[PDB]
Amino acid sequence: SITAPEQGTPVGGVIAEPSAQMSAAADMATGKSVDSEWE
Amino acid sequence: SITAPEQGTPVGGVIAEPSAQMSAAADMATGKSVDSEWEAFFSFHTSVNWSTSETQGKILFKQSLGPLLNPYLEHLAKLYVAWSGSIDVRFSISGSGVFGGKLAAIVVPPGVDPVQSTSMLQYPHVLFDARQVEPVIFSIPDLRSTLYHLMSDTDTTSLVIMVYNDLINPYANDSNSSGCIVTVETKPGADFKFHLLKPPGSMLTHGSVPSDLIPKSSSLWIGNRHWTDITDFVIRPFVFQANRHFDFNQETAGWSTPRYRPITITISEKNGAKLGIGVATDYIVPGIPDGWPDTTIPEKLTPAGDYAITNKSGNDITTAAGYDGADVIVNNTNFKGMYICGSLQRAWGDKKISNTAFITTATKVDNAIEPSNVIDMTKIAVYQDTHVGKEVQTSDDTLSLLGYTGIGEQAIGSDRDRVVRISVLPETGARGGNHPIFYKNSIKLGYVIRSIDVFNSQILHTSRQLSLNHYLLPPDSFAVYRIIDSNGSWFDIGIDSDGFSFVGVSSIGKLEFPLTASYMGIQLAKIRLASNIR
Amino acid sequence: SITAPEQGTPVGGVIAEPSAQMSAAADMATGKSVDSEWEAFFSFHTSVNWSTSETQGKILFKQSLGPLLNPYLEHLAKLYVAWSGSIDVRFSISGSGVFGGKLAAIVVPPGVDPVQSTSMLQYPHVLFDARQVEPVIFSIPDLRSTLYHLMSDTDTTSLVIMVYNDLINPYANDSNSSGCIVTVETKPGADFKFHLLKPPGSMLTHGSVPSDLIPKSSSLWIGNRHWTDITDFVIRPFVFQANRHFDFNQETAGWSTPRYRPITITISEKNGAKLGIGVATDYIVPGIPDGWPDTTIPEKLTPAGDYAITNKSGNDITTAAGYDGADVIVNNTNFKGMYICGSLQRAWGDKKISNTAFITTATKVDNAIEPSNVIDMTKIAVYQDTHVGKEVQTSDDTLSLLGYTGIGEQAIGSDRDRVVRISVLPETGARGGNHPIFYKNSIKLGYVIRSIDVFNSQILHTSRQLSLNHYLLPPDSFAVYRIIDSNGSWFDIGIDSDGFSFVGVSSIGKLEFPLTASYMGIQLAKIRLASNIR
Amino acid sequence: AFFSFHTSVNWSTSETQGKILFKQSLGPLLNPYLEHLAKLYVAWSGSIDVRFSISGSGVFGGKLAAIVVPPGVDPVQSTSMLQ
Ligand SMILES: [K+]
Numbered sequence A: 001s002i003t004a005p006e007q008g009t010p011v012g013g014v015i016a017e018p019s020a021q022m023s024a025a026a027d028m029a030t031g032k033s034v035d036s037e038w039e
Numbered sequence B, C: 001s002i003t004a005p006e007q008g009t010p011v012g013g014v015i016a017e018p019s020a021q022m023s024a025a026a027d028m029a030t031g032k033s034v035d036s037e038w039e040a041f042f043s044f045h046t047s048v049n050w051s052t053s054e055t056q057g058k059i060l061f062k063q064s065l066g067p068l069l070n071p072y073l074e075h076l077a078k079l080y081v082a083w084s085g086s087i088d089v090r091f092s093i094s095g096s097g098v099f100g101g102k103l104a105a106i107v108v109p110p111g112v113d114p115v116q117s118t119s120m121l122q123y124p125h126v127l128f129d130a131r132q133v134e135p136v137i138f139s140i141p142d143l144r145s146t147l148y149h150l151m152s153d154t155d156t157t158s159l160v161i162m163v164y165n166d167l168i169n170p171y172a173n174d175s176n177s178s179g180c181i182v183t184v185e186t187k188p189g190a191d192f193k194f195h196l197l198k199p200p201g202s203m204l205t206h207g208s209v210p211s212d213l214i215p216k217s218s219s220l221w222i223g224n225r226h227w228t229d230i231t232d233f234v235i236r237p238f239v240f241q242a243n244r245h246f247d248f249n250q251e252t253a254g255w256s257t258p259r260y261r262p263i264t265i266t267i268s269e270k271n272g273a274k275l276g277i278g279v280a281t282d283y284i285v286p287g288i289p290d291g292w293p294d295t296t297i298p299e300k301l302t303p304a305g306d307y308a309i310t311n312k313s314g315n316d317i318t319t320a321a322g323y324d325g326a327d328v329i330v331n332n333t334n335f336k337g338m339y340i341c342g343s344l345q346r347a348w349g350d351k352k353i354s355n356t357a358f359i360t361t362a363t364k365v366d367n368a369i370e371p372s373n374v375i376d377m378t379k380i381a382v383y384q385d386t387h388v389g390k391e392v393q394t395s396d397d398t399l400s401l402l403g404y405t406g407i408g409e410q411a412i413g414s415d416r417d418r419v420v421r422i423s424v425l426p427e428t429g430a431r432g433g434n435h436p437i438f439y440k441n442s443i444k445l446g447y448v449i450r451s452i453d454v455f456n457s458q459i460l461h462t463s464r465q466l467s468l469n470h471y472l473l474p475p476d477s478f479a480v481y482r483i484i485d486s487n488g489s490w491f492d493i494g495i496d497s498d499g500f501s502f503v504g505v506s507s508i509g510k511l512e513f514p515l516t517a518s519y520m521g522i523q524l525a526k527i528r529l530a531s532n533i534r
Numbered sequence D: 001a002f003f004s005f006h007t008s009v010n011w012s013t014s015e016t017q018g019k020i021l022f023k024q025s026l027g028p029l030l031n032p033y034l035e036h037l038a039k040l041y042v043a044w045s046g047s048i049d050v051r052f053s054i055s056g057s058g059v060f061g062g063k064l065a066a067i068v069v070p071p072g073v074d075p076v077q078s079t080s081m082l083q
């Protein structure tokens, strides 16, 4: 009955998958900090 | 000495070689699992309506086996001579647990002409209900006498859906049929395999599907009989046209082609003849020009003078309020049911610049004409003054269909007896619960500013593509297209092999004409189409 | 409930199931044990001749990486969007053993455009001799800045052969000249994957690939200035047109549309005014009727009466021998440079036969007209004898382009002083060695039955598609379509973003016109277009 | 770590088999928090999640269909996308 703030049925990426080998590629080109750069 | 289809000594990309580490990064971008994606999901094929009226022993769906049931295969069948194997066809009913009505499903062996009869259920039938949750599959097998089929074979397994319990819904009406639609989807199946590769050239390229038979808008649309735009759809239980009415066999009873070009003819006279027997200069049928129209005169008449119309049978009137302010209209004219072509009216050594023409089919007798509708090389008719004194003229001419004369009339293409056919008139009646239609198209009138309403069987663009491209359809099905007026309403249209449009509603009325069109799929002919109005 | 791209409860074939014992029998007949054969057998792509006259530093072969180097891949790319990985390019050669000569091979990186000079050899190169026996491979890697490519990517790796050391026939004199050949084949490689499956019938966002601008056959061809069929091509250094010249930005500077319909207008003549100023009724630009032509009167003149010609003081022709035998046809007529316009000419009271019309763009001066090669709402001009009697008429009208009356002139469109722009005259000179072309059309004439020529920048269908369908063409590039007559004489046409065609030869001559047009691809305007003539 | 409202539609009765109810290319604009932060960056990378809720608690029949079209295409208002 209730649906909570983060409650749903994950079917997800139908054709693909939100990979992780890729996001770190964007990271290494631009560098990072702990989710903030104005500190 | 010999070298095989792969042999050859390698040296490799000299500055660098192909790095698999690179190509993996491409697969890292996508979710590239494996090629041949089409073997791992479903594809839309069509969608069939199922109204209240579909009494049982009446079919919805019927498709033989083959690759054409999944276009990804249809694109690859051009590379392989032969194929073999199964095919899975998904099913799914609209109406989410709301409706009733079981629905059968039969695979038949090859070599049959199925029938809308319950005897088809004297056979192993699977049933499923309109309260279906999970869609349904029905893996078709490939039953055959030969090791591998070809692309041309037809004697194959074939699936059918037929009704087993008529539905129930209190949420529909006799006119519209919004509701049940039976989506069908396909997938090749595990054992499916092409066979016997071929080089391109050959790439035969047949299997053309109806997808461009109509544009996706109105402003491109024009009737085949007359050049003006469409503004309305008209129903009539019968239907008839021959001039440009083309069928999927890429032929007709029509002397004409689907191009609104002018008409070149070399009329000839002796002394003072206004009228003469126009003769061909371009044609496809001997004697008859291309683009030549189809409507006879109503009656015998001696074309000899000017326009004249009279209200009340007691007057003569030359203005709008007198036109509308009229008991009736009489048309005491001598070229009544005629046309208004342009008539460049050339000749050798003939000044006295071109005048306007007036043309129909009719049989000419020495000063007059009479309606004949069986057109031949003699029935052509003209009434342009080419300035002929006492000598043969040899007047070449060109003519472009441009208007009408028969004021008092209120439509064209409604009296079949006046329609010009060579010998045969294509014609249909209602089918399933669907009915024919015409496409209305306003037209000029001549002396009076008003217009009048034509009936048309075919958009030109429809009739052009049939002239050329070998589209595929069985004899007893449509090539359904959809229509959406700009009020959000909609209705569907079917197209038989003959070319006659068909519809499923009882009425249309007024509608937001700036509308669109799209292609849903194929539908068996003998079923009421879908609709939703207001 | 929530069903996935494959989810569905199975039931199986009801009478049978796919018997995998069967399908092996198909694999038993054929050699079908493996899919994707094209990854393991070479394929012709082209062939080359190499002779003693071809000196050192010449470039024989030059092809860029892509799928098109193996037409199987050219056929499968239509499903997909992207590609990544390498290609193999087999080289095979057979020389006598007495011959010599060494022949190079270079993969070059992207971004470059090679040059027929030895400085290209100041770079890693692999050689091989005409005595070579076993074929050679030269895997072409993919050296790219992106994770993958689309199909519209030319900035790729590429390959070249070049004549390192020339060919030697010791027995041959220096006068006679022999030469071996070189055959090339390809294969996709191993790391060569496509990507990013396309859902048909999608519309790629940057635009589709132009392969329908020109209809293949001829009979579908008509020009963008007059409806008559093409018959021949015409070269000019300069070209220009605005009436229907639509670029790949789907716009123009014109006023008209790609439909040869009639032209409704209204006209408000008073006293005996044969002429007037017709006003707009249907358009896309305010105050200009759609489909209106683009050509001024050559000179000022007084529209008065009927035709007039001469034979230099003054023996008027009234036949063919005088005309075709005449020297000049000076055309003393007083309505010279106008079209002919079939002329319905309705109104209240004009119970007449709708005399014929003549038009141009020009300013009236109280009885007559002055040329003006810019259209406004005013330049529109008429001469059609509306049967006026100081009983102000206000006739509605509708016309049709048929011929022309400026007898003896050159073909229309070769005089920008006359042509009717608004503000901008679209135009090109040449680009590279490739020259423009008009398309010719025979157009009709009024008095003498002969016909004059027209110039057309574009086929109509070439212009219709650009009104609608957003395409890709980098402005430095061409869309290359290939022509073949009945004999076999071919030449390639180029088409620019603007729309003006181009060709890579100074003349054509005569050819069996039932010709066709085929697609080849994109090519850079900085390069000449090919031609095999006679 | 939660879901954020974006918009709302009206899948009324007069809509048919092939219409589109929603179509948005990827970006921060699918969440009004992220859009307020895209002003502080010139870049992004990664998936976004979505959630729907239809208001037919158990009544309204009828279903929808979703597609993840790739980058480069520009989908159309027909059924063909369901191939
Ligand atoms: K004449």
Ligand SMILES: [K+]
Pocket: B447, C344, C345, C346, C347, C350, C351, C352, C353, C354
């Ligand atoms: K009149």
